[PDB]
Amino acid sequence: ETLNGGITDMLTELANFEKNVSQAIHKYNAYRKAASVIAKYPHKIKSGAEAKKLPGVGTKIAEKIDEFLATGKLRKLEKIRQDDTSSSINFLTRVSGIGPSAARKFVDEGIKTLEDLRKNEDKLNHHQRIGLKYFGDFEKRIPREEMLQMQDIVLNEVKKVDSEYIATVCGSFRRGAESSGDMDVLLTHPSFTSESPKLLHQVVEQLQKVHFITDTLSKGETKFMGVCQLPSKNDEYPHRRIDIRLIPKDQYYCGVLYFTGSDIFNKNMRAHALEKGFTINEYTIRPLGVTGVAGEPLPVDSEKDIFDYIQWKYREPKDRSEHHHHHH
DNA sequence: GTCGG
DNA sequence: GCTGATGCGC
DNA sequence: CCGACGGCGCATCAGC
Ligand SMILES: Nc1ccn([C@@H]2CS[C@H](COP(=O)(O)OP(=O)(O)OP(=O)(O)O)O2)c(=O)n1
Ligand SMILES: [Cl-]
Ligand SMILES: [Cl-]
Ligand SMILES: [Mn+2]
Ligand SMILES: [Mn+2]
Ligand SMILES: [Mn+2]
Ligand SMILES: [Mn+2]
Ligand SMILES: [Mn+2]
Ligand SMILES: [Mn+2]
Ligand code: NA
Ligand code: NA
Ligand code: NA
Ligand code: NA
Ligand code: NA
């Protein structure tokens, strides 16, 4: 049903291999950019030289596309699929907190399966231990109905802590997705500005007291990463990833732009900002110094002002998701 | 792996 | 302590 | 060994 789905799946799989096995994050990012520009292309790709016209597809991917169109497979991928070490390394990196490095370490020490991982809980740090505990739950996506229920608990508890907080659910939810991988809550409070608690900790602690937050992956002064769960209906819902991030109140628009994603959109926007002579992060957009210090932050009164600076047409959150096209 | 310089 | 990497996460 | 590639929080380490 997906136009060019065979091609985009091949490139994604190559991506994951370069990240997890090769530890080559820019090759990962290259395959992702290629899968992405191909996914958004509104025609069926006839040949490698056709895909090559797209930014991000070059000689080597063009050849893989010719091989794939011609044979229905890619020998490079068949060999990777046959490498049990590579397969186990890929699998282990699905646990939150285990990356390419840890994964290879565990596999080299003979941990190759989920059971093997469970038997070796003592090798895992806290984050990894919690990732493992909820591995099955974290594989499932969250229906938007349940995201609405989750949003209701979060906003009500935050308002009980202090009515000056504003919490906004971002990520895929704000982009209008019909399901989400986690819940991203952007939080502000007038006591925390770029110039100026316990602000985050008070919120987290209140969510724990009402048994909504069940576990913590990591937690600092400005960012919480953890686990939550909706109250059961009779006798249970899966446990869910939740990210909460306090951002400076005077820097809300850069913050919400960031927290809305998608991942690929944000990166592409920042790459286009560099080309135009700016640097964008979640707090500011700044001109690049002739030296190599960014200069003073530019004024921003809306999401659109950020786009304007880098000469990009404004996109509504729903148009910042990745998309694909279909065939009959 | 792709691209720009 | 601070700075700057390394790993891993949004 | 062309070098850059988006950018930063939290956890941790190395060097000072
Ligand atoms: N590589 C990345 C990853 C995330 N981000 C930011 C962090 S906050 C925002 C949303 O990140 P998430 O990882 O929750 O993704 P989405 O909400 O798009 O999807 P799901 O959670 O999978 O529904 O994008 C980024 O700028 N670069
Ligand atoms: Cl790389
Ligand atoms: Cl900044
Ligand atoms: Mn579809
Ligand atoms: Mn398109
Ligand atoms: Mn062993
Ligand atoms: Mn999300
Ligand atoms: Mn998230
Ligand atoms: Mn551009
Ligand atoms: Na190209
Ligand atoms: Na191997
Ligand atoms: Na992981
Ligand atoms: Na053990
Ligand atoms: Na569960």
Q: Whose CA is nearest to atom 14 of ligand 1?
A: A171
Q: Is A223's CB less than 7 Å from nucleic acid strand D? A: yes
Range of the domain at A9: 1-83
Q: Of A186, A198, A185, whose CA–CA distance to A241 is shortest?
A: A185
- CA dihedral (A315, A318, A323, A328) in degrees, to 10, reads -120
CA atoms within 13 A on the CB side of A219: 16
**A132 Cβ contact partners less than 8 Å away, ≥ 6 residues apart:** A95, A117, A118, A121, A124
Q: Do A206 and A289 have their domain in common?
A: no
Q: Do A268 and A167 have their domain in common?
A: no
For A101 and C6, how far is CA from C1' in angstroms?
10
Classify burial at A146, counting beta carbons within 10 Å of its beta carbon; exposed 0-12, middle 13-18, buried 19 or more.
middle
User: Which residues of A participate in catalysis according to the annotation?
Assistant: 64
Q: Binding site annotation covers A240?
A: no
Q: What is the resolution of this structure in A?
A: 2.0
> Does residue A328 form part of some domain?
no
How many structural domains is chain A composed of? 4
The runs of H, that is alpha helices, within chain A are: 5-20, 25-39, 48-52, 59-71, 75-81, 84-92, 100-108, 114-119, 126-133, 135-138, 144-161, 171-174, 199-209, 252-260, 263-276, 303-309
Q: Of A103, A109, A79, whose CA–CA distance to A89 is shortest?
A: A103
Q: Do A230 and A210 have their domain in common?
A: yes
Boundary of a domain, candidates A237, A258, A279: A258
Q: Do A272 and A231 have their domain in common?
A: no
Q: Is A98's CB less than 7 Å from nucleic acid strand C? A: yes
Q: Of A167, A188, A190, A174, whose CA–CA distance to A257 is shortest?
A: A174
Which residues lie across from A326 on neighbouring strands? A2
> Does residue A226 form part of some domain?
yes
At residue A219, what is the residue type?
A: K
Site to probe by mutation for ligand 1, drawn from A263, A267, A323 as the one with most ligand atoms within 8 Å of Cβ, is: A263
Distance CA A176, CA A50 (A): 32
Q: Do A152 and A233 have their domain in common?
A: yes
Residue A142 near residue A180, CB atoms below 8 Å: yes
Interval between CA A124 and ligand 13 midpoint (Å): 10
Q: Do A162 and A134 have their domain in common?
A: no
Residue A57 near residue A34, CB atoms below 8 Å: yes
Count Cβ neighbours within 10 Å for each residue of A226-264 and write b for 16 or more, e otherwise: bbbbbeeeeeebebbbbbbbbbbbbbbbbbbbbbbbbeb
**End-to-end C-alpha distance for chain A, whole angstroms:** 7
Distance CA A169, CA A185 (A): 5
Q: Do A250 and A198 have their domain in common?
A: yes
Q: Do A150 and A248 have their domain in common?
A: yes
Residue A245 near residue A223, CB atoms below 8 Å: yes
Atom of ligand 1 nearest to the CA of A262: 18
Q: Binding site annotation covers A54?
A: yes
Q: Of A42, A59, A11, A55, whose CA–CA distance to A272 is shortest?
A: A55
Q: Do A164 and A254 have their domain in common?
A: yes
- CA A315 to chain CA centroid, nearest Å: 19
Q: Do A123 and A163 have their domain in common?
A: no
Q: Is A95's CB less than 7 Å from nucleic acid strand C? A: yes
